[PDB]
PDB file of all heavy atoms in Angstrom:
ATOM      1  N   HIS A 101     106.835 106.153  87.688  1.00 17.74           N
ATOM      2  CA  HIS A 101     108.245 106.002  88.061  1.00 17.74           C
ATOM      3  C   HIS A 101     108.999 107.324  87.982  1.00 17.74           C
ATOM      4  O   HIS A 101     109.745 107.687  88.900  1.00 17.74           O
ATOM      5  CB  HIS A 101     108.941 104.946  87.210  1.00 17.74           C
ATOM      6  CG  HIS A 101     108.365 103.580  87.344  1.00 17.74           C
ATOM      7  ND1 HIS A 101     108.425 102.641  86.336  1.00 17.74           N
ATOM      8  CD2 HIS A 101     107.716 102.992  88.369  1.00 17.74           C
ATOM      9  CE1 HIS A 101     107.836 101.528  86.740  1.00 17.74           C
ATOM     10  NE2 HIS A 101     107.399 101.706  87.971  1.00 17.74           N
ATOM     11  N   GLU A 102     108.790 108.048  86.891  1.00 15.50           N
ATOM     12  CA  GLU A 102     109.414 109.350  86.722  1.00 15.50           C
ATOM     13  C   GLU A 102     108.922 110.316  87.785  1.00 15.50           C
ATOM     14  O   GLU A 102     109.711 111.052  88.402  1.00 15.50           O
ATOM     15  CB  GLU A 102     109.100 109.920  85.323  1.00 15.50           C
ATOM     16  CG  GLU A 102     109.769 111.238  85.045  1.00 15.50           C
ATOM     17  CD  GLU A 102     109.737 111.609  83.569  1.00 15.50           C
ATOM     18  OE1 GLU A 102     108.666 112.088  83.097  1.00 15.50           O
ATOM     19  OE2 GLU A 102     110.747 111.405  82.886  1.00 15.50           O
ATOM     20  N   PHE A 103     107.616 110.315  88.016  1.00 16.74           N
ATOM     21  CA  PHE A 103     107.025 111.083  89.097  1.00 16.74           C
ATOM     22  C   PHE A 103     107.691 110.807  90.440  1.00 16.74           C
ATOM     23  O   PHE A 103     108.075 111.715  91.155  1.00 16.74           O
ATOM     24  CB  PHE A 103     105.515 110.781  89.196  1.00 16.74           C
ATOM     25  CG  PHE A 103     104.855 111.470  90.341  1.00 16.74           C
ATOM     26  CD1 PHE A 103     104.346 112.744  90.189  1.00 16.74           C
ATOM     27  CD2 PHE A 103     104.771 110.860  91.583  1.00 16.74           C
ATOM     28  CE1 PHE A 103     103.732 113.397  91.254  1.00 16.74           C
ATOM     29  CE2 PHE A 103     104.170 111.510  92.656  1.00 16.74           C
ATOM     30  CZ  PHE A 103     103.668 112.780  92.475  1.00 16.74           C
ATOM     31  N   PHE A 104     107.844 109.515  90.760  1.00 18.56           N
ATOM     32  CA  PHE A 104     108.465 109.090  92.018  1.00 18.56           C
ATOM     33  C   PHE A 104     109.900 109.644  92.157  1.00 18.56           C
ATOM     34  O   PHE A 104     110.275 110.125  93.207  1.00 18.56           O
ATOM     35  CB  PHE A 104     108.461 107.565  92.118  1.00 18.56           C
ATOM     36  CG  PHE A 104     109.045 107.018  93.395  1.00 18.56           C
ATOM     37  CD1 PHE A 104     108.756 107.612  94.614  1.00 18.56           C
ATOM     38  CD2 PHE A 104     109.853 105.890  93.382  1.00 18.56           C
ATOM     39  CE1 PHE A 104     109.274 107.089  95.800  1.00 18.56           C
ATOM     40  CE2 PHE A 104     110.374 105.371  94.542  1.00 18.56           C
ATOM     41  CZ  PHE A 104     110.077 105.974  95.759  1.00 18.56           C
ATOM     42  N   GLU A 105     110.660 109.561  91.071  1.00 18.97           N
ATOM     43  CA  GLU A 105     112.006 110.075  91.050  1.00 18.97           C
ATOM     44  C   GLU A 105     112.017 111.583  91.316  1.00 18.97           C
ATOM     45  O   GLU A 105     112.795 112.079  92.131  1.00 18.97           O
ATOM     46  CB  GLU A 105     112.636 109.794  89.701  1.00 18.97           C
ATOM     47  CG  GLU A 105     114.027 110.382  89.504  1.00 18.97           C
ATOM     48  CD  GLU A 105     114.757 109.671  88.385  1.00 18.97           C
ATOM     49  OE1 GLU A 105     114.468 109.953  87.217  1.00 18.97           O
ATOM     50  OE2 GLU A 105     115.637 108.831  88.698  1.00 18.97           O
ATOM     51  N   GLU A 106     111.137 112.298  90.634  1.00 18.68           N
ATOM     52  CA  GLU A 106     111.042 113.747  90.770  1.00 18.68           C
ATOM     53  C   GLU A 106     110.565 114.154  92.150  1.00 18.68           C
ATOM     54  O   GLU A 106     111.104 115.087  92.757  1.00 18.68           O
ATOM     55  CB  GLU A 106     110.140 114.305  89.707  1.00 18.68           C
ATOM     56  CG  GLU A 106     110.744 114.265  88.324  1.00 18.68           C
ATOM     57  CD  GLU A 106     109.928 114.997  87.282  1.00 18.68           C
ATOM     58  OE1 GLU A 106     108.979 115.708  87.663  1.00 18.68           O
ATOM     59  OE2 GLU A 106     110.238 114.864  86.074  1.00 18.68           O
ATOM     60  N   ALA A 107     109.544 113.446  92.646  1.00 16.28           N
ATOM     61  CA  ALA A 107     108.994 113.652  93.997  1.00 16.28           C
ATOM     62  C   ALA A 107     110.086 113.393  95.028  1.00 16.28           C
ATOM     63  O   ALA A 107     110.287 114.185  95.952  1.00 16.28           O
ATOM     64  CB  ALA A 107     107.817 112.746  94.224  1.00 16.28           C
ATOM     65  N   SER A 108     110.806 112.289  94.840  1.00 16.26           N
ATOM     66  CA  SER A 108     111.902 111.947  95.720  1.00 16.26           C
ATOM     67  C   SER A 108     112.948 113.081  95.756  1.00 16.26           C
ATOM     68  O   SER A 108     113.386 113.469  96.816  1.00 16.26           O
ATOM     69  CB  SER A 108     112.530 110.606  95.324  1.00 16.26           C
ATOM     70  OG  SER A 108     111.622 109.538  95.582  1.00 16.26           O
ATOM     71  N   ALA A 109     113.289 113.614  94.581  1.00 19.23           N
ATOM     72  CA  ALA A 109     114.224 114.745  94.496  1.00 19.23           C
ATOM     73  C   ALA A 109     113.740 115.967  95.271  1.00 19.23           C
ATOM     74  O   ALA A 109     114.548 116.714  95.839  1.00 19.23           O
ATOM     75  CB  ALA A 109     114.486 115.111  93.026  1.00 19.23           C
ATOM     76  N   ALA A 110     112.425 116.171  95.301  1.00 14.78           N
ATOM     77  CA  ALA A 110     111.771 117.239  96.044  1.00 14.78           C
ATOM     78  C   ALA A 110     111.757 116.985  97.568  1.00 14.78           C
ATOM     79  O   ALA A 110     111.200 117.799  98.331  1.00 14.78           O
ATOM     80  CB  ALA A 110     110.331 117.418  95.550  1.00 14.78           C
ATOM     81  N   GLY A 111     112.295 115.846  98.008  1.00 17.27           N
ATOM     82  CA  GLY A 111     112.266 115.451  99.417  1.00 17.27           C
ATOM     83  C   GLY A 111     110.999 114.706  99.825  1.00 17.27           C
ATOM     84  O   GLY A 111     110.764 114.499 101.006  1.00 17.27           O
ATOM     85  N   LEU A 112     110.183 114.287  98.853  1.00 17.67           N
ATOM     86  CA  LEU A 112     108.897 113.651  99.138  1.00 17.67           C
ATOM     87  C   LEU A 112     108.930 112.145  98.902  1.00 17.67           C
ATOM     88  O   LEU A 112     108.012 111.556  98.303  1.00 17.67           O
ATOM     89  CB  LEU A 112     107.792 114.310  98.299  1.00 17.67           C
ATOM     90  CG  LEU A 112     107.611 115.794  98.621  1.00 17.67           C
ATOM     91  CD1 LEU A 112     106.711 116.480  97.607  1.00 17.67           C
ATOM     92  CD2 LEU A 112     107.076 115.984 100.047  1.00 17.67           C
ATOM     93  N   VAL A 113     109.988 111.483  99.379  1.00 17.01           N
ATOM     94  CA  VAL A 113     110.111 110.050  99.188  1.00 17.01           C
ATOM     95  C   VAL A 113     109.270 109.256 100.197  1.00 17.01           C
ATOM     96  O   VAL A 113     108.657 108.248  99.845  1.00 17.01           O
ATOM     97  CB  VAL A 113     111.579 109.576  99.247  1.00 17.01           C
ATOM     98  CG1 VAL A 113     112.193 109.849 100.604  1.00 17.01           C
ATOM     99  CG2 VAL A 113     111.684 108.080  98.894  1.00 17.01           C
ATOM    100  N   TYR A 114     109.273 109.707 101.452  1.00 15.78           N
ATOM    101  CA  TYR A 114     108.543 108.981 102.517  1.00 15.78           C
ATOM    102  C   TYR A 114     107.348 109.792 102.963  1.00 15.78           C
ATOM    103  O   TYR A 114     107.458 110.970 103.252  1.00 15.78           O
ATOM    104  CB  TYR A 114     109.401 108.731 103.751  1.00 15.78           C
ATOM    105  CG  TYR A 114     110.753 108.146 103.482  1.00 15.78           C
ATOM    106  CD1 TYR A 114     111.862 108.614 104.173  1.00 15.78           C
ATOM    107  CD2 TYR A 114     110.925 107.119 102.563  1.00 15.78           C
ATOM    108  CE1 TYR A 114     113.123 108.074 103.936  1.00 15.78           C
ATOM    109  CE2 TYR A 114     112.187 106.581 102.315  1.00 15.78           C
ATOM    110  CZ  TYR A 114     113.274 107.068 103.010  1.00 15.78           C
ATOM    111  OH  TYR A 114     114.541 106.544 102.772  1.00 15.78           O
ATOM    112  N   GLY A 115     106.220 109.122 103.040  1.00 11.70           N
ATOM    113  CA  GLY A 115     105.027 109.769 103.563  1.00 11.70           C
ATOM    114  C   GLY A 115     103.779 108.940 103.327  1.00 11.70           C
ATOM    115  O   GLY A 115     103.839 107.759 103.018  1.00 11.70           O
ATOM    116  N   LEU A 116     102.649 109.599 103.525  1.00  9.60           N
ATOM    117  CA  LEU A 116     101.347 109.013 103.251  1.00  9.60           C
ATOM    118  C   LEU A 116     100.354 110.094 102.862  1.00  9.60           C
ATOM    119  O   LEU A 116     100.579 111.286 103.087  1.00  9.60           O
ATOM    120  CB  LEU A 116     100.834 108.227 104.459  1.00  9.60           C
ATOM    121  CG  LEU A 116     100.211 108.988 105.632  1.00  9.60           C
ATOM    122  CD1 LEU A 116      99.690 108.005 106.675  1.00  9.60           C
ATOM    123  CD2 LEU A 116     101.211 109.958 106.242  1.00  9.60           C
ATOM    124  N   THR A 117      99.280 109.661 102.241  1.00  6.85           N
ATOM    125  CA  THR A 117      98.199 110.558 101.860  1.00  6.85           C
ATOM    126  C   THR A 117      96.905 110.012 102.465  1.00  6.85           C
ATOM    127  O   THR A 117      96.567 108.832 102.300  1.00  6.85           O
ATOM    128  CB  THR A 117      98.088 110.675 100.342  1.00  6.85           C
ATOM    129  OG1 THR A 117      99.309 111.189  99.826  1.00  6.85           O
ATOM    130  CG2 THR A 117      96.923 111.586  99.944  1.00  6.85           C
ATOM    131  N   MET A 118      96.212 110.885 103.192  1.00  5.60           N
ATOM    132  CA  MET A 118      94.904 110.600 103.755  1.00  5.60           C
ATOM    133  C   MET A 118      93.866 111.174 102.799  1.00  5.60           C
ATOM    134  O   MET A 118      93.799 112.393 102.647  1.00  5.60           O
ATOM    135  CB  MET A 118      94.768 111.261 105.130  1.00  5.60           C
ATOM    136  CG  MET A 118      95.917 111.004 106.082  1.00  5.60           C
ATOM    137  SD  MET A 118      96.123 109.155 106.556  1.00  5.60           S
ATOM    138  CE  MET A 118      94.225 108.821 106.862  1.00  5.60           C
ATOM    139  N   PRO A 119      93.068 110.325 102.149  1.00  6.60           N
ATOM    140  CA  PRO A 119      92.014 110.896 101.300  1.00  6.60           C
ATOM    141  C   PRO A 119      90.994 111.692 102.127  1.00  6.60           C
ATOM    142  O   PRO A 119      90.724 111.377 103.269  1.00  6.60           O
ATOM    143  CB  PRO A 119      91.350 109.679 100.666  1.00  6.60           C
ATOM    144  CG  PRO A 119      92.320 108.574 100.802  1.00  6.60           C
ATOM    145  CD  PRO A 119      93.029 108.852 102.105  1.00  6.60           C
ATOM    146  N   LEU A 120      90.449 112.729 101.487  1.00  9.30           N
ATOM    147  CA  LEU A 120      89.454 113.578 102.111  1.00  9.30           C
ATOM    148  C   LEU A 120      88.176 113.534 101.300  1.00  9.30           C
ATOM    149  O   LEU A 120      88.188 113.723 100.089  1.00  9.30           O
ATOM    150  CB  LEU A 120      89.980 115.014 102.194  1.00  9.30           C
ATOM    151  CG  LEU A 120      91.368 115.220 102.774  1.00  9.30           C
ATOM    152  CD1 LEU A 120      91.717 116.695 102.735  1.00  9.30           C
ATOM    153  CD2 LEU A 120      91.433 114.684 104.210  1.00  9.30           C
ATOM    154  N   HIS A 121      87.068 113.284 101.977  1.00 10.83           N
ATOM    155  CA  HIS A 121      85.782 113.328 101.339  1.00 10.83           C
ATOM    156  C   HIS A 121      84.837 114.040 102.290  1.00 10.83           C
ATOM    157  O   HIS A 121      84.477 113.512 103.336  1.00 10.83           O
ATOM    158  CB  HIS A 121      85.328 111.926 100.958  1.00 10.83           C
ATOM    159  CG  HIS A 121      86.210 111.264  99.942  1.00 10.83           C
ATOM    160  ND1 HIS A 121      87.263 110.456 100.293  1.00 10.83           N
ATOM    161  CD2 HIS A 121      86.255 111.357  98.598  1.00 10.83           C
ATOM    162  CE1 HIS A 121      87.887 110.041  99.209  1.00 10.83           C
ATOM    163  NE2 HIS A 121      87.284 110.576  98.161  1.00 10.83           N
ATOM    164  N   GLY A 122      84.531 115.281 101.942  1.00 11.62           N
ATOM    165  CA  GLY A 122      83.781 116.148 102.822  1.00 11.62           C
ATOM    166  C   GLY A 122      82.298 115.921 102.734  1.00 11.62           C
ATOM    167  O   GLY A 122      81.802 115.295 101.794  1.00 11.62           O
ATOM    168  N   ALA A 123      81.587 116.447 103.733  1.00 12.25           N
ATOM    169  CA  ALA A 123      80.149 116.286 103.833  1.00 12.25           C
ATOM    170  C   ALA A 123      79.384 116.875 102.641  1.00 12.25           C
ATOM    171  O   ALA A 123      78.258 116.484 102.364  1.00 12.25           O
ATOM    172  CB  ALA A 123      79.652 116.889 105.139  1.00 12.25           C
ATOM    173  N   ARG A 124      79.983 117.850 101.955  1.00 13.07           N
ATOM    174  CA  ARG A 124      79.344 118.467 100.806  1.00 13.07           C
ATOM    175  C   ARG A 124      80.042 118.123  99.502  1.00 13.07           C
ATOM    176  O   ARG A 124      80.118 118.937  98.577  1.00 13.07           O
ATOM    177  CB  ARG A 124      79.235 119.985 101.037  1.00 13.07           C
ATOM    178  CG  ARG A 124      78.185 120.355 102.089  1.00 13.07           C
ATOM    179  CD  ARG A 124      76.763 120.237 101.540  1.00 13.07           C
ATOM    180  NE  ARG A 124      75.797 119.789 102.546  1.00 13.07           N
ATOM    181  CZ  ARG A 124      74.827 120.538 103.075  1.00 13.07           C
ATOM    182  NH1 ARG A 124      74.655 121.824 102.726  1.00 13.07           N
ATOM    183  NH2 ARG A 124      74.023 120.012 103.984  1.00 13.07           N
ATOM    184  N   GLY A 125      80.557 116.896  99.408  1.00 15.11           N
ATOM    185  CA  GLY A 125      81.109 116.366  98.172  1.00 15.11           C
ATOM    186  C   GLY A 125      82.534 116.825  97.850  1.00 15.11           C
ATOM    187  O   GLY A 125      83.027 116.550  96.759  1.00 15.11           O
ATOM    188  N   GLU A 126      83.191 117.503  98.792  1.00 14.86           N
ATOM    189  CA  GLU A 126      84.557 117.939  98.592  1.00 14.86           C
ATOM    190  C   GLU A 126      85.469 116.732  98.405  1.00 14.86           C
ATOM    191  O   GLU A 126      85.280 115.713  99.080  1.00 14.86           O
ATOM    192  CB  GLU A 126      85.058 118.790  99.763  1.00 14.86           C
ATOM    193  CG  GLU A 126      84.254 120.073 100.066  1.00 14.86           C
ATOM    194  CD  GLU A 126      83.091 119.854 101.027  1.00 14.86           C
ATOM    195  OE1 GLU A 126      82.677 118.704 101.249  1.00 14.86           O
ATOM    196  OE2 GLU A 126      82.582 120.847 101.582  1.00 14.86           O
ATOM    197  N   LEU A 127      86.416 116.840  97.486  1.00 13.20           N
ATOM    198  CA  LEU A 127      87.419 115.802  97.207  1.00 13.20           C
ATOM    199  C   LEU A 127      88.776 116.392  97.526  1.00 13.20           C
ATOM    200  O   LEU A 127      89.130 117.473  97.052  1.00 13.20           O
ATOM    201  CB  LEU A 127      87.384 115.387  95.738  1.00 13.20           C
ATOM    202  CG  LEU A 127      88.550 114.513  95.230  1.00 13.20           C
ATOM    203  CD1 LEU A 127      88.625 113.184  95.966  1.00 13.20           C
ATOM    204  CD2 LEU A 127      88.424 114.295  93.725  1.00 13.20           C
ATOM    205  N   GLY A 128      89.529 115.683  98.373  1.00 12.76           N
ATOM    206  CA  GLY A 128      90.784 116.190  98.849  1.00 12.76           C
ATOM    207  C   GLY A 128      91.846 115.182  99.205  1.00 12.76           C
ATOM    208  O   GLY A 128      91.645 113.956  99.064  1.00 12.76           O
ATOM    209  N   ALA A 129      92.979 115.705  99.612  1.00 12.47           N
ATOM    210  CA  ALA A 129      94.075 114.933 100.171  1.00 12.47           C
ATOM    211  C   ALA A 129      94.774 115.703 101.279  1.00 12.47           C
ATOM    212  O   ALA A 129      94.968 116.913 101.160  1.00 12.47           O
ATOM    213  CB  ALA A 129      95.077 114.581  99.080  1.00 12.47           C
ATOM    214  N   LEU A 130      95.127 115.019 102.357  1.00 13.03           N
ATOM    215  CA  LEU A 130      96.057 115.542 103.341  1.00 13.03           C
ATOM    216  C   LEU A 130      97.253 114.571 103.262  1.00 13.03           C
ATOM    217  O   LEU A 130      97.186 113.428 103.700  1.00 13.03           O
ATOM    218  CB  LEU A 130      95.505 115.517 104.769  1.00 13.03           C
ATOM    219  CG  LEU A 130      96.465 115.936 105.829  1.00 13.03           C
ATOM    220  CD1 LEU A 130      96.754 117.362 105.614  1.00 13.03           C
ATOM    221  CD2 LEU A 130      95.899 115.733 107.212  1.00 13.03           C
ATOM    222  N   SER A 131      98.295 115.093 102.655  1.00 13.79           N
ATOM    223  CA  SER A 131      99.545 114.358 102.530  1.00 13.79           C
ATOM    224  C   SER A 131     100.579 114.875 103.512  1.00 13.79           C
ATOM    225  O   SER A 131     100.635 116.074 103.760  1.00 13.79           O
ATOM    226  CB  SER A 131     100.095 114.502 101.109  1.00 13.79           C
ATOM    227  OG  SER A 131      99.241 113.918 100.136  1.00 13.79           O
ATOM    228  N   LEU A 132     101.372 113.972 104.058  1.00 14.10           N
ATOM    229  CA  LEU A 132     102.410 114.347 104.996  1.00 14.10           C
ATOM    230  C   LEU A 132     103.663 113.549 104.653  1.00 14.10           C
ATOM    231  O   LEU A 132     103.600 112.328 104.505  1.00 14.10           O
ATOM    232  CB  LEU A 132     101.969 114.031 106.430  1.00 14.10           C
ATOM    233  CG  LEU A 132     100.587 114.507 106.907  1.00 14.10           C
ATOM    234  CD1 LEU A 132      99.539 113.437 106.578  1.00 14.10           C
ATOM    235  CD2 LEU A 132     100.596 114.792 108.401  1.00 14.10           C
ATOM    236  N   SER A 133     104.814 114.231 104.536  1.00 11.84           N
ATOM    237  CA  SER A 133     106.111 113.587 104.323  1.00 11.84           C
ATOM    238  C   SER A 133     106.881 113.546 105.627  1.00 11.84           C
ATOM    239  O   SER A 133     106.786 114.467 106.443  1.00 11.84           O
ATOM    240  CB  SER A 133     106.982 114.311 103.290  1.00 11.84           C
ATOM    241  OG  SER A 133     107.031 115.634 103.782  1.00 11.84           O
TER     242      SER A 133
END
């Protein structure tokens, strides 16, 4: 909840995150607001 408030303050209230899992075990995120 605190994170959400802080993120929201940063302008990151609306968006989505696409998980990334690469062919060589890479772990990632592509997030877009």
Side-chain angles (χ1 to χ4, degrees):
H101 297 152
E102 182 166 80
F103 176 88
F104 182 41
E105 175 160 77
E106 289 188 10
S108 291
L112 299 169
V113 63
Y114 311 137
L116 79 176
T117 300
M118 311 297 316
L120 309 179
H121 296 94
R124 288 284 146 110
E126 301 89 343
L127 168 61
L130 175 67
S131 295
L132 312 88
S133 54

